[PDB]
Design a protein around this motif. Structure first.
Motif, mmCIF file in Angstrom:
data_model
loop_
_atom_site.group_PDB
_atom_site.id
_atom_site.type_symbol
_atom_site.label_atom_id
_atom_site.label_comp_id
_atom_site.label_asym_id
_atom_site.label_seq_id
_atom_site.Cartn_x
_atom_site.Cartn_y
_atom_site.Cartn_z
ATOM 1 N N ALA A 1 0.803 -1.209 0.000
ATOM 2 C CA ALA A 1 0.000 0.000 0.000
ATOM 3 C C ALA A 1 0.840 1.264 0.000
ATOM 4 N N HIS A 2 2.153 1.157 -0.197
ATOM 5 C CA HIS A 2 3.030 2.327 -0.211
ATOM 6 C C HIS A 2 2.807 3.084 -1.516
ATOM 7 N N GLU A 3 1.695 3.813 -1.562
ATOM 8 C CA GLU A 3 1.280 4.451 -2.801
ATOM 9 C C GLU A 3 2.098 5.700 -3.069
ATOM 10 N N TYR A 4 2.409 6.453 -2.021
ATOM 11 C CA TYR A 4 3.151 7.685 -2.214
ATOM 12 C C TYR A 4 4.621 7.420 -2.464
ATOM 13 N N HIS A 5 5.131 6.301 -1.990
ATOM 14 C CA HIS A 5 6.501 5.964 -2.313
ATOM 15 C C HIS A 5 6.610 5.194 -3.616
ATOM 16 N N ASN A 6 5.497 4.953 -4.298
ATOM 17 C CA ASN A 6 5.527 4.212 -5.545
ATOM 18 C C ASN A 6 6.025 5.091 -6.683
ATOM 19 N N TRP A 7 6.200 4.470 -7.843
ATOM 20 C CA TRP A 7 6.542 5.203 -9.048
ATOM 21 C C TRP A 7 5.336 5.532 -9.906
ATOM 22 N N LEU A 8 4.285 4.720 -9.856
ATOM 23 C CA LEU A 8 3.098 4.943 -10.667
ATOM 24 C C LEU A 8 1.892 4.883 -9.753
ATOM 25 N N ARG A 9 1.106 5.942 -9.740
ATOM 26 C CA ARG A 9 0.048 6.073 -8.761
ATOM 27 C C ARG A 9 -1.295 5.686 -9.369
ATOM 28 N N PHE B 1 -2.549 6.418 -13.198
ATOM 29 C CA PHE B 1 -2.208 5.482 -14.263
ATOM 30 C C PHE B 1 -3.209 4.345 -14.340
ATOM 31 N N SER B 2 -3.641 3.835 -13.188
ATOM 32 C CA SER B 2 -4.666 2.802 -13.172
ATOM 33 C C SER B 2 -5.982 3.342 -13.700
ATOM 34 N N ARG B 3 -6.369 4.530 -13.245
ATOM 35 C CA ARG B 3 -7.660 5.072 -13.631
ATOM 36 C C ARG B 3 -7.678 5.611 -15.048
ATOM 37 N N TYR B 4 -6.524 5.756 -15.693
ATOM 38 C CA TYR B 4 -6.563 5.986 -17.129
ATOM 39 C C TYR B 4 -6.465 4.689 -17.917
ATOM 40 N N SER B 5 -5.626 3.756 -17.472
ATOM 41 C CA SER B 5 -5.413 2.530 -18.220
ATOM 42 C C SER B 5 -6.609 1.602 -18.161
ATOM 43 N N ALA B 6 -7.449 1.731 -17.145
ATOM 44 C CA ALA B 6 -8.622 0.881 -17.059
ATOM 45 C C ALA B 6 -9.790 1.392 -17.886
ATOM 46 N N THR B 7 -9.620 2.476 -18.634
ATOM 47 C CA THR B 7 -10.725 2.947 -19.453
ATOM 48 C C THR B 7 -10.282 3.417 -20.829
ATOM 49 N N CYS B 8 -9.106 3.148 -21.202
ATOM 50 C CA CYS B 8 -8.717 3.589 -22.528
ATOM 51 C C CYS B 8 -9.186 2.586 -23.574
ATOM 52 N N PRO B 9 -9.460 3.032 -24.797
ATOM 53 C CA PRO B 9 -9.685 2.077 -25.883
ATOM 54 C C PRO B 9 -8.396 1.351 -26.202
ATOM 55 N N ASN B 10 -8.520 0.190 -26.836
ATOM 56 C CA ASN B 10 -7.365 -0.677 -27.015
ATOM 57 C C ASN B 10 -6.622 -0.409 -28.317
ATOM 58 N N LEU C 1 0.090 5.969 -22.622
ATOM 59 C CA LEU C 1 0.559 5.403 -21.367
ATOM 60 C C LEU C 1 2.075 5.372 -21.310
ATOM 61 N N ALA C 2 2.741 5.310 -22.463
ATOM 62 C CA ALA C 2 4.193 5.417 -22.461
ATOM 63 C C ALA C 2 4.640 6.832 -22.144
ATOM 64 N N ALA C 3 4.113 7.806 -22.867
ATOM 65 C CA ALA C 3 4.610 9.161 -22.720
ATOM 66 C C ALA C 3 3.981 9.903 -21.553
ATOM 67 N N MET C 4 3.130 9.255 -20.766
ATOM 68 C CA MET C 4 2.810 9.808 -19.461
ATOM 69 C C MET C 4 3.875 9.510 -18.418
ATOM 70 N N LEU C 5 4.957 8.830 -18.786
ATOM 71 C CA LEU C 5 6.055 8.581 -17.868
ATOM 72 C C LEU C 5 7.204 9.553 -18.055
ATOM 73 N N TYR C 6 6.942 10.745 -18.572
ATOM 74 C CA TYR C 6 8.017 11.713 -18.703
ATOM 75 C C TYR C 6 8.349 12.307 -17.344
ATOM 76 N N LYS C 7 9.637 12.421 -17.062
ATOM 77 C CA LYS C 7 10.091 12.848 -15.751
ATOM 78 C C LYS C 7 10.004 14.360 -15.633
ATOM 79 N N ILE C 8 9.877 14.836 -14.398
ATOM 80 C CA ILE C 8 9.733 16.269 -14.177
ATOM 81 C C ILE C 8 10.947 16.748 -13.399
#
Lengths: 49, 49
Positions: free
Chosen positions: A1-9, A12-21, A29-36
């Motif tokens: 449950a270490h959600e805040y210490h995770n890399w993907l919160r 990502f789940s709430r977008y990936s569970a509803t995108c068309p295939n 989903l790839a380019a949402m991993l750009y670092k800040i």
């Protein structure tokens, strides 16, 4: 449950569970991993992204 | 409504349970199709499979 210490919160789940295939979903989903990091910030803006 | 019991005409009130029990004169079928197009759009499915 270490959600805040995770890399993907929960966004990502709430977008990936509803995108068309279509492949564009895989792309976004790839380019949402750009670092800040500051160097990633200048690397993004130097190519008009 | 005015329900007819045995030699009396007592009133009968009952709750609508869903939105579909509304009459056609106040909530037509085309409106329901146009609303469920929006509901299908909200789940990122406006092109259906």
């Amino acid at each position: 449950a270490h959600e805040y210490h995770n890399w993907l919160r929960s966004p990502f789940s709430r977008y990936s569970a509803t995108c068309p295939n279509v492949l564009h979903s895989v792309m976004t989903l790839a380019a949402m991993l750009y670092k800040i990091s500051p160097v990633s910030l200048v690397l993004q803006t130097k190519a008009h992204i | 409504t005015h329900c007819q019991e045995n030699s009396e005409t007592v009133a009968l009130c009952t709750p609508r349970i869903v939105i579909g029990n509304l009459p056609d004169g106040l909530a037509p079928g085309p409106f329901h199709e146009l609303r469920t197009w929006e509901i299908m759009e909200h789940m990122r499915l406006r092109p259906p499979p």
